[PDB]
Amino acid sequence: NRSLIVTTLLEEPFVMFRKSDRTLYGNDRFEGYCIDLLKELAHILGFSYEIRLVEDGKYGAQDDKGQWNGMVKELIDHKADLAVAPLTITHVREKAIDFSKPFMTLGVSILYRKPNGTNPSVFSFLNPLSPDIWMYVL
């Protein structure tokens, strides 16, 4: 088929840069899980593509009024006709574009910074009482 224009956004480890000491353009800017998966289905379903990033850098959704922007507006306006991304199947996003079958179905995990342990101590034990009183015992 034609070069189906792909709106996308770089994620970890989904869509990543192609890096070297020289110039790279368009499809040759970008690799990753989604892009090298896309290089398989270009042989499967018989199409080419152009990769474009999204501007606002985000998915983009309906505003206070109800107007799509970002990734959805690209497929609405047909300036992009594909979106190679983990585009999460959301029931409001079904109302301007159509989803295919999901390739991955995962959930919301919890990130928190790690305290990396501690040592036992007795200066900690000096603290539930005022530290001058511990010398007042003497």
Binding site: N1, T7, E11, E12, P13, F14, G32, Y33, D36, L37, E40, I44, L45, D56, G57, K58, Y59, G60, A61, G70, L75, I76, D81, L82, A83, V84, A85, P86, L87, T88, I89, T90, V92, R93, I97, D98, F99, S100, K101, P102, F103, M104, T105, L106, G107, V108, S109, I110, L111, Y112, R113, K114, N116, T118, N119, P120, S121, V122, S124, F125
Partner: protein, 158 residues
């Protein structure tokens, strides 16, 4: 006693948390209709700055501040397997599908409907998933008291 669940995170308001804006997390957080998460929506509504605009920004929130971040497991997997100053807490919440973007009214998606189940039996998504994801008190401190008292009586007279 520590936290590894969702209700006790709904208990604490002591760790800052938001999400990536224009994220499907936040797009579901406005659709979150159980009051344990409606109060975390009232948290995130009371904190527009806990909301981030970049996952990398929320990375620098958790790296530079005591910041819980509630995103999808995939990037939390790939980065906490590669960053050890950040801890993984508990499990997941749900599982939502990742559609492939077509404009509405696309009959070529019928071909896209076929090839996904092609890759489902051939298990190619997990093959690339292993390809593209890569892994990596007061109890003891008391020893200041008695040991010196045994030595003073030696060097007195004899």
């Amino acid at each position: 006693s520590p936290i590894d669940s969702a209700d006790d995170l709904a208990k604490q308001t002591k760790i800052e948390y938001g999400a990536v804006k224009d994220g499907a997390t936040m797009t579901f957080f406005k659709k979150s209709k159980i009051s344990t998460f409606e109060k975390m929506w009232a948290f995130m509504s009371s904190k527009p700055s806990a909301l981030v605009k970049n996952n990398e920004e929320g990375i620098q929130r958790t790296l530079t501040a005591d910041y819980a971040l509630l995103m999808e497991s995939t990037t939390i997997e790939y980065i906490t397997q590669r960053n050890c100053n950040l801890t993984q807490i508990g499990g997941l919440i749900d599982s939502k599908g990742y559609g492939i973007g077509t404009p509405m009214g696309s009959p070529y998606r019928d071909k896209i409907t076929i090839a996904i189940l092609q890759l489902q039996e051939e298990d190619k998504l997990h093959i690339m998933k292993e390809k593209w994801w890569r892994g990596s008190q007061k109890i003891g401190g008391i020893f200041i008291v008695l040991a010196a008292g045994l030595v003073l009586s030696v060097l007195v007279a004899v």
